[PDB]
Nucleic acid binder design. Sequence first.
RNA 1: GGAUUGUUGAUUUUGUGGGUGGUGGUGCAUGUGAUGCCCGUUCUGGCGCGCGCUACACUGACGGAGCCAGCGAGAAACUCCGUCGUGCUGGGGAU
Lengths: 213, 229, 30, 229, 97, 27, 129
Amino acid sequence: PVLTSKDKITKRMIVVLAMASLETHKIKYVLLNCDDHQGLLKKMGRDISEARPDITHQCLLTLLDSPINKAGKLQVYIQTSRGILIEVNPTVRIPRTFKRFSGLMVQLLHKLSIRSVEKLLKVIKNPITDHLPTKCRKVTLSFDAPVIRVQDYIEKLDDDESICVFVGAMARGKDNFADEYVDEKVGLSNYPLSASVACSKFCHGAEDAWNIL
Amino acid sequence: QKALPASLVPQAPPVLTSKDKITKRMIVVLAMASLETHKIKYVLLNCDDHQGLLKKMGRDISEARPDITHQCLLTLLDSPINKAGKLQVYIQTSRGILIEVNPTVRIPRTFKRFSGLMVQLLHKLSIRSVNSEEKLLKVIKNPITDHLPTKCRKVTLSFDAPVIRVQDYIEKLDDDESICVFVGAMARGKDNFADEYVDEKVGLSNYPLSASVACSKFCHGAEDAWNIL
Amino acid sequence: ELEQQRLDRMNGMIELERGVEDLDDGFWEN
Amino acid sequence: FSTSDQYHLVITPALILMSQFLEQIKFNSLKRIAFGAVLVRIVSQYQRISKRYIPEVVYFFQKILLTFIVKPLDFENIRLDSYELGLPLDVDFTKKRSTIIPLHTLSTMPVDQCVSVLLNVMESLDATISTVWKSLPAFNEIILPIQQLLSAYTSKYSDFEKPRNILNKVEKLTKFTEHIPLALQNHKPVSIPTHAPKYEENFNPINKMKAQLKKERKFTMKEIRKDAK
Amino acid sequence: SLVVQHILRLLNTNVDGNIKIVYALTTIKGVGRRYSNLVCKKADVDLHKRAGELTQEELERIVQIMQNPTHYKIPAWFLTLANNVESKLRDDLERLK
Amino acid sequence: DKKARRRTLRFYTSKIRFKGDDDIPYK
Amino acid sequence: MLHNPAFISNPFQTPDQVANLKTLKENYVDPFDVHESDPELTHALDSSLWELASLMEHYHPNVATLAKIFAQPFKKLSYNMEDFLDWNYDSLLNAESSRKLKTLPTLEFEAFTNVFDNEGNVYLPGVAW
RNA sequence: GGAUUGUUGAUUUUGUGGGUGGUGGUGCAUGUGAUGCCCGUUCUGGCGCGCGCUACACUGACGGAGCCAGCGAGAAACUCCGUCGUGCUGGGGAU
């Protein structure tokens, strides 16, 4: 079954792309990029370092293409930096090229809706907590936090529950974006991990923990 | 009772090199990379940006995607196995160009700047660091086998092959040996591009796997095997 | 807000937001 | 002012100036000891949250406790400055005696006054043990000299209850605390070195001025020859 | 039990204590093999020693030898147009036509 | 004595990395 | 002495290794003797420097920073001792005043009704006017 | 008895506090909505195809010593003894 935010009972993997920098700028509205639009962001006054929707694309690309998504056991949420929440339908097949990825997000942010003829990408009302499962564990990725085995972590958790991971898509920033919602912080590796790598490593553990294979 | 090492200061593990064959390691051959240049300025041929010209070349536009090759290197290089100094990437261009990827390199995250490096690399035949201390991307002479370790296991990613556990596989393999994975960055094609060199082909999952996903899945289990963490 | 600032200052956040480790530059030298 | 700061304009010079008094002052008179007793209380509250370790508080406590038992010949590592302040044996230590030291009495200044200063110093000791030293890894080492001193207090004054409760409290803390070898030089492994590539964004397959001269001079030389030809 | 005898900083230059004194000082800019030999001879530091094994007074003497070389009588030996061309040649080309 | 060894240790004293998703510098 | 590697806990260590580690922790006793006068018999080498760990919680910031060096890698080959010998309480106070960087004064949001105790909220309990 | 304007007359000026996003947009409901959602002005400039030679050191670099040719009429490589030392180093010699 295609999992939806309505259903709370099923054990599911919620991977939260927090603080995503997917911003539309009109001179026509186009997704802002750290390299394509440097002077424009300077006029807007925002730093071009944290102007990278590129990082978000690969995370969705590896999450959506992971075997766990194919098994119908994973959902992805994107909390935009300005405060826009997006639910990513597991069935969506986002473009592999970034140019076409950008063209969708301007459609999504302005239309608030991407429909196919269920809605594939949907902007939804904050907070994230209500959308999450009723019985659910919340963690983030913290480099300073103790390193833990993901497979051992998921195994020791209960069955009816679910686990949330608030992955920070930023190039750089303090790991306090999801501190309000979460109850603890965990590290995945001694070395720093890219957002794409860390969730790819994380989702691999979930596949081994449940024998998704 | 054992004497402690004199210096507990961290030292980065040695940057592995093709000249070095003894060390146990993990080689990943991104076979069939669609990396081609052409003057318009030389620009890396792409499936979307350059459709008309590649038709004029007579090559299909379906298999003109350096994005897949770019994605595999990002996850491979950013993998925490690479941080442990236990992995290199070889790229076998569809044209027949073999490229050695130094573990220390940083391909730019943006694909546009990645394409700039590949037209850059393909023409000079090399890439040098900003500080001019080491060659990061160097093209190397075929066949690929000479550059590989003397004792090494070779496998390919095959959808039709039996599904195996990467962790169990690497555990049962010897220690002094190394393992080679010939991953097809090719979008769609028959899995024989490494048949001549490789001895056996294995499947990683029942479901189809993208090249970026499959290689990332392989390496994560490898660290579980060797406890790279 | 004030409580978070006090916790930050206790951990070494010094407001001119530098760190205590910076105050130890040349202190022992002279 | 905010006392719970690692560095402050007024607190830190005050604390440094103040820690000097807890150590430098002789504390050889009841006025002087009572001054030190209040000095202890302010530094205790300066660290009411930061909970930092002040070595002078340990030194001040050791001498004042021993000052009122004068020597028993068992503590030769403690430097006393007055041996005529030993409390008499006839002291009851069961009456309810005010532990609050008025500062106006400081100017005025016997046994009751000496005992009261001992309690206010003694009560501060329990709070320091309960809060500050309990957390420190070297709690047993820090409390060991103090524990011996209070054993003399209980042996000399059986009726005196304050040392026994704190001795019982000190015993409770040591039992639960696990005194394990310290481990600090466990470091996160460092990654392999890291360098960015060097290249030209738009790759070309005075310097420009020279080349223009070379290219067309050859054109000039060629065309004169055929014209002269 | 009491017997009192890897790197060092000289001239704001790190010289490895492992290397011989003369060739450890050669690494210093402006210090050659022959000049370092002469400095070692003047300082009365017998040349065979390693940089690490030098005592304080010997390093002080070496520094004084170098910093005051004349004082110790060290020998004196030890111590647009392209555009104009292009424009002229363009004129020649035009005139030839 | 301090001044004498203050001279000694001048010659002993010796005066004087991307992570995660950090990109290479632009230009 | 600063660090005994046998007492480090590793995530990969098997459950049996975990159990053996706990037994080792339980049975440890500090063997350093303070009263032995022969330094070759004090059994200090088998002990550890818990005292240095306390000093990294020292009230003075710079003193705490110096103690923290033992928790940092020993990159530095040596420390110029002459830069640390002649320090006094007066020198520290003078150094505090002659600070390269000047910081803003901060204030306490917490409010105390009475600074000294009587004979609502008292700052100094146990001391009275 | 001139704060201030450009002559003028209390419109301002100064010091301390201090509310405001609004000649803001975009859609929604028969214009209206304590609507949802977010957040300017005028000029001044703007190569392709090919040769030959030198390097990437320890079979090498440097300091000494030893020495062997044949062409043609308006020596080196090399050998002996020393230094150096896997470090873009005592290789490289452009600027």
